[PDB]
Amino acid sequence: ATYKVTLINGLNKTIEVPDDQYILDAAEEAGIDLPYSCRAGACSTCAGKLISGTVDQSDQSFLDDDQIEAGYVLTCVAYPTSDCVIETHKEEELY
Numbered sequence: 700a701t702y703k704v705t706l707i708n709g710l711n712k713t714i715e716v717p718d719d720q721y722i723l724d725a726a727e728e729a730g731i732d733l734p735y736s737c738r739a740g741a742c743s744t745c746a747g748k749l750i751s752g753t754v755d756q757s758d759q760s761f762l763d764d765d766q767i768e769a770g771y772v773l774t775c776v777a778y779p780t781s782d783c784v785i786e787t788h789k790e791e792e793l794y
């Protein structure tokens with residue numbers, strides 16, 4: 700499957716993401732400059748907030764159960780599992 704991932708912050712664009720591609724990688728192929736540092740699921744730099752839809756970010760490690768429950772997603776290690784809508788650049792909300 701290929702899912703429509705809407706990325707919002709002067710950013711408002713919907714990209715196509717195969718279910719076996721990470722959202723950050725797909726955003727970069729679409730020319731979108733999203734924040735990152737480790738690209739390995741171990742920090743908050745690439746954090747976004749899921750507004751609708753679902754992801755598989757099982758390779759992540761930084762976010763705790765409670766941050767995941769609140770809708771945070773580490774875009775560098777997140778695969779879409781449905782069409783979804785993500786607010787980007789959300790690291791600041793964790794602190």
Ligand code: FES
Pocket residue numbers: 734735736737738739740741742743744745746761773774775776
């Ligand atoms: S850039 Fe570090 S977790 Fe995504």
